[PDB]
Design a binder for this molecule. Structure first.
Ligand SMILES: *[C@@H]1O[C@H](CO)[C@@H](O[C@@H]2O[C@H](CO)[C@@H](O[C@@H]3O[C@H](CO)[C@@H](O)[C@H](O)[C@@H]3O)[C@H](O)[C@H]2NC(C)=O)[C@H](O)[C@H]1NC(C)=O
Ligand SMILES: *[C@@H]1O[C@H](CO)[C@@H](O[C@@H]2O[C@H](CO)[C@@H](O[C@@H]3O[C@H](CO)[C@@H](O)[C@H](O)[C@@H]3O)[C@H](O)[C@H]2NC(C)=O)[C@H](O)[C@H]1NC(C)=O
Ligand code: ZMR
Ligand code: ZMR
Ligand code: ZMR
Ligand code: ZMR
Ligand code: NAG
Ligand code: NAG
Ligand code: NAG
Ligand code: NAG
Ligand code: NAG
Ligand code: NAG
Ligand code: CA
Ligand code: CA
Ligand code: CA
Ligand code: CA
Ligand code: CA
Ligand code: CA
Ligand code: CA
Ligand code: CA
Ligand code: CA
Lengths: 387, 387, 387, 387
């Protein structure tokens, strides 16, 4: 076992090849499948796993009732091999949590699971399944984290946490974690910024995060930092807005775009110089459809022109959260860090007439060979027998 | 593989971070989950597992009928990874048993499973799944043991067993077991004491057990011994009574507290000098709620003052059995033995209108970083379809 | 990996300690559990497994209909860890078979699975799951084998097969198998003998088999042989008759006891000099109850006196097939071969008003420490929802 | 780990011994079993696995509705150990796909999964679960591949793909793949030929494929090539026609037999000099029955005489697809490549009155010891509760 170097650059990619699809909701109609949301993928040098927050209940059972609710004592972080349905029969228990992150440093798994009351939540850190540290809410207002994989470089793993209002200025901290122990942290000086649910990845020994502004930005905020946590901040400038909801594409801003800026959804983007691969919903007002857009100057440029668009989920189909995950050379045998991404396909409340809310997932990995756009939707027929 | 040293002291702890929650009853509403009770956790140098006594039946099936009953030929000791639901599809078979204990010496698993008739029960000992010894009832009155993990020190594992009345003077024996073979035992000379379901842990090469007096003590009895089985006995002196049922907190006794002393529940406590971490129900009359209390002089002092209280399960929620389990430095990489504990959340009979009785579990580990009190209850909605 | 020596003697035993119980039928009321019969246990140097013949169907499903039937194209030999329920989710596939045997030589598993038509059945031999040999019916009349573990000595494994009438003189062959290849066989010269479903075990480099006479013997025939297949034959002389059905205990015979000699049940016995450990039903006319009897001169003596009787299953409870299995020193660390045995608990047709027939199992291992008699029955409530 | 040599000849075989049967449909009546079709078997140096295309749904659930449909975004390639039912609880995820192939080179698994739209499908290649290459439709008309195992020789694996009409001239390409990377391909110059769903195996360092002519051939086309992709093409000359549908046996042709030549079914054959082992349905008009025929001059001879016929599935029972798979000396310890084959037993639409279509499987391996013909059908009772 050797720790991930994380010192190579991102592999340039021309398109996205489908990597997995679990059909969780379709199968859960009869099978014993967890009610879940906020799934995400993360890989070790040996395997890739799907992490997810259960509602401590199964699909098509009465306990799935009211699962639109975000936080409860019953939610747990669990994981299974990528592409398999999240079942009590194939899932490893990770932590008790209604907000989470996880990543492998090359030696062991780090998991971060947040539970407890809204006014005093505690993040429990585990390394190889052993509790190694905790961090408690510092603003007493829903301590929350990535809902996707943390990022590791040379034995150090990094994550971002938020505490404070979801509709106004909050507090954002970056953490450096070694073998499950917080060895350093810093609060970001980001007046008028809002950071939630960051999708972070390593690139040339540094970390880049693309996050969610739930306050007043329809474009996505970003934060990048080195291992010493010296950071820079900004927003993606492209007029191809990345959040949901958002306005129709137009002239963008390198600051928060106020138009339709309230609320949002977890998302991601990959930076390549001045260019950016943007993953986003197809709808500007709802969580449906998904597409990947290559914008050669979208990181720093404000125009709404782009070069490549690839369909992932049809506009008439439900989508939801999305996030980045990477495959290190230690896993692939490549000389660069390969970008992949996952999409949560949310079914149920509030948009559908069920008693429950749950999601399935799909994932893709970046390649330079031929690819094709299509739609790989959830595919479940609602409502269910339970409703 | 190397045997556990067990020669370091207990890690001082300021609070308890949640470690696991299986949501067994909620999931068993639809999923294939064993009807169980008397669960407990125990760890090896590699993993932690949940042990439990099945009723040889599944939740929401007719064979769960009458499972309030304590003993039968159908009950079996099984185990699964911690935090996972006890299912026939993820559970390892250990032993046929209606009373049990288990622990890992660093090399292999030792399991103790008691089955047979009330008037002649036999404990079957296994080492790495192979029968290595037996011990038969010596008072012909329900031979019974810990219902939690045994304690191991330098290749020797220790447990306590009881035989005799549950409402009067009984007989109590301590055993030293090496590779599944009983190498020494001694009967405790404890007139007017009553010991049942001891929660035992190693500390500085010696064993400390906190147990249940079902006869006439509302405080908990304890027994401590070295590897040669030279022992000391007493009761926790604190006026913060630990058993259930019990009186309201008042002036305690270093002997058995007669007030509300009959009946009881399995519990635990961690000794730190004259101080004690007490886990107990919140109700004085019923098995509901759970809290952790730090009493700096509660081991030897009789007053009812304390310094710290941390909520674990709300008073309006069902609890049940609780027990200690430790994580050795061989597992954690620490220089001390870490204290953890589990709580059984009992649902069904006799307090609820069902045909069945079963439990789920939660567990916590002691830390010196920030923690928070809350309520992590079972969360199941009774009755079930079967009733 | 090293091949089993099999050159030590049987461990003398004073009683039997319960080893496993799967509660298969009770659990199958709701869980996904195979309809099975003819289960048996066999161990490697690492683990013990339960082998069984499925009916290619699950309990409480319409396809369990008519499963009283012995042979069909759907029956398969599968296995799971001992004590676990036989489910499609935890069972390894072994072979297509309606008659079978299996054993581990210390290096790999040997399985023998017989399928095909009654008039031309073929035994398929597999070593490490690879087909290594076949043997076809030589009398064109239901080629059939042990339904329990074969026996291995120094890299050679041995089994017995029968072909011919179930109600008259048939043909019996012994096989020597090395790495899945038949290297030698011999037909037993046994006029007026009848051998079926032998329970064979190694002892001091030679093999002893105790079998079933379905023709005209209420006592059990035996055959013993060395590695060169030089054999001896006879019947257990004890007036404590071992087959079912049988007469009340009286003066026995060293030849086939004709009284109630037709029909029978698979069983076993362990020989110790002139003495014998006899496992048998409690009923003389039906497959219910089970007991272990130590008869110090029962191998060669015809009287009906005995020294020890241990209850296993109550007379008012269903039993069925039973068989021997051993644990070699390579597994136990002992200096002798330990005797164990399993009992099939048959539920359903023909004695019960269901559409199906299936069994669960219990097992015990011989010890010299204290033991106790009891009843560990199937425990299922029939009929089921399907009937 | 060492790569397969693939340089030995096929093991001559006189008959076929049954190897596996999963009883998937029977078990799926109650159990949680995937709706599948197009199953196939492939082995590594360690184990054999069943690959299959799920419909992203379970048997006896509403989402099995309309599963007669060949292609959708929900279909996925998964695998489980041979002989086990394809369940979400025991199946490994491989790829998103409605057409697939897979094989092991001795070091790692190669999987090929085709998904996307009919007019622009993309094959995603994975090596050890990591995406290594893609190939996109070149005729924009349903890119499709083997639906059985690819063939590996000295670290290179080979497959055949088709793109174009199913009822006329199409385009056929052979690929050489090393560690999941396409290193060479060539389009076959085969005017008036039609190739689909090739069953390919290695023999003496070269590859032989027997395929399906869906255009105008009731006999099967073949293509053979060396590692440099230098190929030869033709049709099986035997008057014992191998496709379905087909004419009654008569005088054959070394070119496509036009009579009943339209439509077809995936099949296989093993070449031995001028002779051929032919696997085929028993019915000339429908997918029922299965038999193995040895025709000593059937590869190059046009007569309808043969030497051996072995029954596999009765004519009154449903069959379906069939394919070859081999076991290399690296797995068996033999000095030749052993031929095996599997048969898909299709149940449901369009021939049966259900809402769904699914298959189970059986498999056989070639031996030179005694064998027997019989019928090992699916055995499920339709319709099901869902219909
Ligand atoms: C679990 O066990 C309980 C108690 O045995 C079952 O409830 C009982 O159901 C039986 C059968 O329906 C009832 O027995 C009948 O009693 C009536 C008189 O009320 C008598 O006339 C009949 O001859 C028969 O004996 C019984 O009343 C009833 N007991 C109670 C307390 O309700 C229950 O059905 C079982 N549940 C499952 C899921 O198996
Ligand atoms: C699987 O799919 C089939 C076909 O869609 C389902 O059968 C169909 O069920 C629907 C809903 O009940 C029926 O639609 C209705 O048709 C009537 C006219 O007959 C119309 O007045 C209603 O407005 C409605 O459209 C439809 O008749 C029926 N089709 C057939 C061929 O029976 C079936 O229910 C599905 N099965 C499962 C388990 O989901
Ligand atoms: C901690 C927590 O509750 N986080 C939220 C989250 C949150 O409400 C917003 O980002 C605003 O702050 O949004 C949503 C969402 O679907 O928008 C899911 C989350 N649910 C879970 N993580 N359980
Ligand atoms: C062997 C046995 O039956 N032990 C008991 C136990 C016992 O009744 C008391 O401690 C009094 O002696 O109490 C209880 C109880 O929930 O209070 C559960 C146990 N159930 C099981 N261990 N199966
Ligand atoms: C090959 C086969 O059918 N063997 C039989 C067996 C047999 O009928 C007798 O011993 C008489 O020959 O008896 C019985 C039995 O329950 O008595 C179960 C078996 N069923 C299975 N092995 N499948
Ligand atoms: C890609 C695809 O759809 N291939 C087909 C296939 C095809 O229609 C013919 O060979 C004609 O081209 O036939 C059949 C069939 O059962 O005949 C099943 C396949 N289904 C799946 N592979 N999913
Ligand atoms: C990246 O890290 C690896 C492992 O330490 C090292 O060998 C290599 O020199 C580094 N690459 C660069 C470009 O610095
Ligand atoms: C869901 O919760 C509501 C309480 O708001 C309750 O009324 C309803 O019965 C529940 N539904 C189910 C199916 O349990
Ligand atoms: C505890 O045991 C270890 C291992 O034998 C030994 O090295 C060490 O000295 C002991 N620790 C103390 C504090 O005595
Ligand atoms: C039994 O076999 C073992 C392993 O070969 C050998 O060492 C030993 O000498 C044998 N024991 C006897 C009593 O022959
Ligand atoms: C069982 O088989 C019989 C045929 O003998 C049939 O009549 C009956 O319907 C079947 N029962 C079930 C539940 O399928
Ligand atoms: C086949 O390959 C093996 C491994 O490279 C080689 O040793 C052997 O010579 C080859 N066999 C033949 C018959 O050429
Ligand atoms: Ca079920
Ligand atoms: Ca926003
Ligand atoms: Ca642009
Ligand atoms: Ca008490
Ligand atoms: Ca005090
Ligand atoms: Ca008889
Ligand atoms: Ca006698
Ligand atoms: Ca054709
Ligand atoms: Ca011919």
């Amino acid at each position: 076992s050797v720790k991930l170097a994380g010192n190579s650059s991102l592999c340039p990619v021309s398109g996205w090849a489908i990597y997995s699809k679990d059909n969780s909701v379709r199968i859960g109609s009869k099978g014993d499948v967890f009610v879940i949301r906020e799934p995400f993928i993360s890989c070790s040098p040996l395997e890739c796993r799907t992490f997810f927050l259960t509602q401590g209940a199964l699909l098509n059972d009465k306990h799935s009732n009211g699962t639109i609710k975000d936080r409860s004592p019953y939610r747990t972080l669990m994981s299974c091999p990528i592409g398999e349905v999240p079942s009590p029969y194939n899932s490893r228990f990770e932590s008790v949590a209604w907000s989470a992150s996880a990543c492998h440093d090359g030696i062991n798994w780090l998991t971060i699971g947040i539970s407890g009351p809204d006014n005093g939540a505690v993040a429990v850190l585990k390394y190889n399944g052993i509790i190694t540290d905790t961090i408690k809410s510092w603003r007493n207002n829903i301590l929350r984290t990535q809902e996707s994989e943390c990022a590791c470089v040379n034995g150090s793993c990094f994550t971002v946490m938020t505490d404070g209002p979801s509709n106004g200025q909050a507090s954002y901290k970056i953490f450096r974690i070694e073998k499950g122990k917080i060895v350093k942290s810093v609060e970001m000086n980001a007046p008028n910024y809002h950071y939630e649910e960051c999708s972070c990845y390593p690139d040339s020994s540094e970390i880049t995060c693309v996050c969610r502004d739930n306050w007043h930005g329809s474009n996505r905020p970003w934060v990048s930092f080195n291992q010493n946590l010296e950071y820079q901040i900004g927003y993606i400038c492209s007029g191809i807005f990345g959040d949901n909801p958002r306005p129709n594409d137009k002239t963008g801003s390198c600051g928060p775009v106020s138009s339709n800026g309230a609320n949002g959804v977890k998302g991601f983007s990959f930076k390549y110089g001045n260019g950016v691969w943007i993953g986003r919903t197809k709808s500007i007002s709802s969580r449906n459809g998904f597409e990947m857009i290559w914008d050669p100057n979208g990181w720093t440029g404000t125009d709404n022109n782009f070069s490549i668009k690839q369909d992932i989920v049809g506009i008439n189909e439900w989508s939801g959260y999305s996030g980045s995950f990477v495959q290190h050379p230690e896993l692939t045998g490549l000389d660069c860090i390969r970008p992949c991404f996952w999409v949560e396909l949310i079914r149920g409340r509030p948009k559908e007439n069920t008693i429950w809310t749950s999601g399935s997932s799909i994932s893709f990995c970046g390649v330079n060979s031929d690819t094709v756009g299509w739609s790989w939707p959830d595919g479940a027929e609602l409502p269910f027998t339970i409703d």
